[PDB]
């Protein structure tokens, strides 16, 4: 499970960069899913059903692999249909250079409301502009949200 995380992080993404990632809050510069190759993925990949779910590395057939995404056949099967009868609304992850990627559609970034985002362990790293956000309970499915 844990070694299904893609560790394809660039050298430029060092601990100093990660320290100042959720440290930038004291701010003028703020705001179709398929097969994603694991070579361009740094960190866990999250999809939202609207509840957050981790999608680990697999081969192209969908069989899970456990080699830190180091293999060149490792991908993330993120194909999605709307989650009343499908799997998830969309997904979010950080790529090798440190940019947050999205795909699919938000559950209503992964925004429930125009001001509230689904809360998940990597929210503060993937979306630093939401560090001053407050956490509220949501029942849509019992999950937590982060709002202004």
């Amino acid at each position, epitope marked *: 499970h844990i070694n299904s*995380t893609a560790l394809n992080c660039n050298e430029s993404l060092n601990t*100093g960069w*990660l*320290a100042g990632l959720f440290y930038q809050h004291k701010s003028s510069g703020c705001p179709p899913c398929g097969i994603v190759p694991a070579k361009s993925v*740094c960190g866990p990949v999250y999809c939202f059903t609207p509840s957050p779910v981790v999608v680990g590395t697999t081969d192209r057939s969908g069989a899970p692999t456990y080699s830190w995404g180091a293999n060149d056949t490792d991908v993330f099967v993120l194909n999605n249909t709307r989650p009343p009868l499908g799997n998830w609304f969309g997904c979010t992850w950080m790529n090798s250079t440190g940019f947050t990627k999205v795909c699919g559609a938000p559950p209503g970034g992964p925004w429930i409301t125009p001001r509230c985002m689904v809360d998940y362990p990597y929210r503060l790293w993937h979306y630093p502009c939401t560090i001053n956000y407050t956490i509220f309970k949501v029942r849509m499915h019992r999950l937590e949200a982060a709002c202004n």
Partner: antibody
Amino acid sequence: VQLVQSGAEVKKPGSSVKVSCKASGGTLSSYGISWVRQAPGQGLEWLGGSIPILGTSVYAQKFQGRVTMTADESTSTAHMELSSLRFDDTAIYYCAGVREGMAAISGKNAFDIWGQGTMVTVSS
Amino acid sequence: DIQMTQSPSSLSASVGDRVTITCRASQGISNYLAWYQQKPGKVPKLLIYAASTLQSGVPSRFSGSGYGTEFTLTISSLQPEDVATYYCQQHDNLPLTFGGGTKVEIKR
């Protein structure tokens, strides 16, 4: 600037040893602390290591069922615990890292700062 | 596991000789290879990073080269203070793995 390790010990086979690694004047999390051991007159062997993007440490499968690595930011001290010690575990244990916050968040690091080393001797 | 094969086991040379240490890899590791020097009784020092990037405060006589599977650490003018075991470590894949090491001694 310096990583200071605990003192040499002798432990009986099947027991446990805990080794500390104190980073003077620095945030322990920025160094990407790994543990590398060296048997007497032999090569270097990488046990576990810290992975910032996961916020925890992962271990080589050779030690997965009997090594745990902790880090206390409030005391700038990292620990390595090795359980069920066998005679083959007699070595000098180094904590290692890279300075100035240049540690790759992937954990795939070359280390330019090393502790002084701690010899653990498994014997009765 | 990436495996590092480093040659030779032991090496003897004279002050002022070129010394070449080779390190082969079981998979392509791009240029993600480091070299350490470890003088007896001391901790390893990082000399070369990312195959050819020399570390700060390292004599210009040490250099690295290579891309893919085979890498070489070369010491243009061997000096008395250069006697120690030299090790290569790959930093492209987990687990991080080291070479056997090459013991460098001096004929005088």
